[PDB]
Write a protein that binds this ligand. Structure first.
Ligand SMILES: COC(=O)c1c(O)cc(O)c(C(=O)OC)c1CCc1nccn1Cc1ccccc1
Ligand SMILES: [Mg+2]
Ligand SMILES: [Mg+2]
Ligand SMILES: [Mg+2]
Ligand SMILES: [Mg+2]
Ligand SMILES: [Mg+2]
Ligand SMILES: [Mg+2]
Length: 210
């Protein structure tokens, strides 16, 4: 069973802006996704402060970056708090309608696209580099779900029967054919060093067989 939903008009507007605006500094997508992962890790950490059994689904708090040149995907995995089905439907746990408005008002007032994260909607910068994004997520006491969108005004949610994750979120970026530099080890390392060098969780960049 696959359910199909329409994006709210403001989010669809945001996504078509991101897809169609000429903007060369595309690398900021990775900073925004790692920062979102860090926020999700903070939240399961905080909750474990009073209920340590919330770490029963996995005690290790980390971020993995997995390039796959064969599939042309870059995947960002975290063991953060994850998302419920309701979270996914509510724009992946974001206040995206008010955030998009405040991002718009700021764009009109002398901001550039790189500030997107200050308005809570940094996730959508993924569409600077990805033609399709798949989000696999597992929250404690809910099932594992897969969210997906190639923009165009709609997204899908299904129960995920793939590899069970213990807890957390996997963002799978299906890269545009001209954006494969983000699969290169030295390029990913350069971006992480430039924009994410002080994140408070281990970031492991996986390598690939030649
Ligand atoms: C829309 O962002 C994400 O796609 C995203 C991510 O890339 C990595 C993640 O691990 C998570 C996650 O599962 O957060 C539970 C999300 C979705 C939630 C989210 N939306 C904006 C920021 N966040 C992270 C967050 C913020 C406040 C409290 C907890 C977590
Ligand atoms: Mg963030
Ligand atoms: Mg874990
Ligand atoms: Mg792989
Ligand atoms: Mg809102
Ligand atoms: Mg289903
Ligand atoms: Mg590494």
């Amino acid at each position: 069973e696959v359910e199909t939903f329409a994006f709210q008009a403001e989010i669809a507007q945001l996504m078509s802006l991101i897809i169609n605006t000429f903007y060369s500094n595309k690398e900021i997508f990775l900073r925004e996704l790692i920062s979102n992962s860090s926020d999700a890790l903070d939240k399961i950490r905080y909750e474990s402060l009073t209920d340590p059994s919330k770490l029963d689904s996995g005690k290790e708090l980390h971020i993995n970056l997995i390039p796959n040149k064969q599939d042309r995907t870059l995947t960002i995995v975290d063991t953060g708090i994850g998302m419920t089905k309701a979270d996914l439907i509510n724009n992946l746990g974001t206040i995206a309608k008010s955030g998009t408005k405040a991002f718009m008002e700021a764009l009109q007032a002398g901001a550039d696209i790189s500030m997107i994260g200050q308005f809570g909607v940094g996730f959508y910068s993924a569409y600077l580099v990805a033609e399709k994004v798949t989000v696999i997520t597992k929250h404690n006491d809910d099932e594992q779900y897969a969210w997906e969108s190639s923009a165009g005004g709609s997204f899908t949610v299904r129960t995920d029967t793939g590899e069970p994750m213990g807890r957390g979120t996997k963002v799978i970026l299906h890269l545009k054919e001209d954006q494969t530099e983000y699969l290169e080890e030295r390029r990913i390392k350069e971006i992480v060093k430039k924009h994410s060098q002080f994140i408070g969780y281990p970031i492991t960049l996986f390598v690939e067989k030649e």
